[PDB]
Amino acid sequence: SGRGKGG
Amino acid sequence: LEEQEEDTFRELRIFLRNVTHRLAIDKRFRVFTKPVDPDEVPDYVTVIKQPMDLSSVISKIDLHKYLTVKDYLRDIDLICSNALEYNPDRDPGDRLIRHRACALRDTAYAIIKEELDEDFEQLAEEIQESRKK
């Protein structure tokens, strides 16, 4: 995974 | 003559435009209607080699890049699989985007299952086969 959105 | 082959692909593109429009106006799939923006998600390109989204699918339909619904679904699957590969499962936003990716996949397959004539699809796949020769 990457770090994810909204960050 | 071989006009019949081009007629098949023209009808296929019209069908694909219709399916894609229904996906793109579904509020659940807004997040997949534009490419992921590296300015908002700077690590995206370090995870995802082949980005895809519904606006790119529409461009590809119009430039004749899909000769079969199989190849179209390959790109719907890629939207979903990119989203499940990139997005972790740590907060409610992550879970929402992951559930939306699966629903995009499931919705597209269900429309296709319901509305696509199998002999029509098979003809398109076999023309593509004969053009590979």
Numbering used by the authors:
A (entry chain B): 1 to 7
B (entry chain A): 978 to 1110
The paper states:
ATPase family, AAA domain-containing protein 2 (ATAD2), also known as ANCCA (AAA+ nuclear coregulator cancer-associated), has a bromodomain and two AAA ATPase domains. The ATAD2 bromodomain (BRD) contains the canonical, left-handed bundle structure of four α-helices (αZ, αA, αB, αC), which support the two highly variable loops, ZA (residues 1003–1030) and BC (residues 1063–1068), which are responsible for forming peptide docking sites. The bromodomain of the ATAD2 protein is classified as a family IV bromodomain based on conserved residues and the structural features it shares with other members of family IV. This chromatin binding protein is able to recognize acetylated lysine through its bromodomain, a chromatin reader domain that is highly conserved across species. ATAD2 was shown to recognize a di-acetylated histone H4K5acK12ac modification that is associated with newly synthesized histones.
To better understand how this longer BRD recognizes di-acetylated ligands, we grew crystals of the ATAD2 BRD (residues 966–1112, C1101A) in complex with the histone H4K5acK8ac (1–10) peptide. While there was missing electron density beyond ligand residue 7, we observed excellent density for residues Ser1-Lys5. Five polar contacts between the ligand and residues in the ATAD2 bromodomain are present in our structure. It forms hydrogen bonds using its backbone carbonyl oxygen to the backbone amide of Gly2, and through its side chain hydroxyl group to the backbone amide of Gly4. As seen in other BRD structures, the conserved asparagine (N1064) coordinates the acetylation modification on residue K5ac. It is also coordinated through an ordered water molecule at the base of the binding pocket that also interacts with Y1021. Members of the ZA loop, V1013, V1018, and the gatekeeper residue I1074 coordinate the acetyllysine residue, potentially by interacting with the carbon atoms in the side chain of K5ac in the binding pocket.
